[PDB]
Amino acid sequence: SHMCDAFVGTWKLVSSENFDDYMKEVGVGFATRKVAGMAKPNMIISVNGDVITIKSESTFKNTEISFILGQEFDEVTADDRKVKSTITLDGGVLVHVQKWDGKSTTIKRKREDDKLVVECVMKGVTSTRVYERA
Numbered sequence: 837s838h839m840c841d842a843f844v845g846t847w848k849l850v851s852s853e854n855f856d857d858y859m860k861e862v863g864v865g866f867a868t869r870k871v872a873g874m875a876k877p878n879m880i881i882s883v884n885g886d887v888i889t890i891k892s893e894s895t896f897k898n899t900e901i902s903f904i905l906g907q908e909f910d911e912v913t914a915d916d917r918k919v920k921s922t923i924t925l926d927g928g929v930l931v932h933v934q935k936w937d938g939k940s941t942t943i944k945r946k947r948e949d950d951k952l953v954v955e956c957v958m959k960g961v962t963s964t965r966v967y968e969r970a
C-alpha cells in the first residue's frame with residue numbers, strides 16, 4: 837500500500853463552480869471556454885511504481901499525464917498551453933503547479949469523504965470541481 841492509493845480509480849465529474857472565471861483568468865478564449873465548460877470529464881488515476889498517470893477524458897479532449905512526484909515535466913493542457921508542471925504530495929494533497937509565459941496556476945486534488953475534490957487557482961480566482969467514483 838502506498839502514496840496515492842486513495843486516489844487510484846475512475847472518477848466522474850459531478851459538480852463544477854467558477855470554472856468559466858478560472859479559465860478567463862488563465863487566458864482561455866471564448867470558444868474553448870464554452871465547450872470546455874460543458875465537458876463532464878472522467879478522471880482516471882493509476883500508479884505503477886513511482887509513476888503516477890492521470891487521464892482526463894471528455895467529449896472535448898482525451899489527455900494524459902505521467903509523472904514522478906517532485907520531477908518537472910512538459911505538459912500540453914487541454915486548452916493548448918505548453919506548460920512546465922511539477923506535482924508533489926503535501927500532506928496527502930496532490931499539488932500540481934503549471935508555469936508558462938511568466939504565469940502560474942495551481943491545481944490541488946484531495947480525497948474528501950467519497951469524493952475527489954479538485955481546486956484550481958489562478959491569481960485570486962478559484963474553481964472547485966467535485967468528482968465521485970464512476
Ligand SMILES: CCOC(=O)c1ccsc1NC(=O)C1=C(C(=O)O)CCC1
Binds near residue numbers: 864868877
Ligand atoms: C483549463 C482548461 O481546461 C480545459 O480546457 C478542459 C477541457 C475539458 S476538461 C478541462 N479542464 C479540466 O477538466 C481541468 C481540471 C479537472 O477537473 O481535471 C483541473 C484544471 C482543468
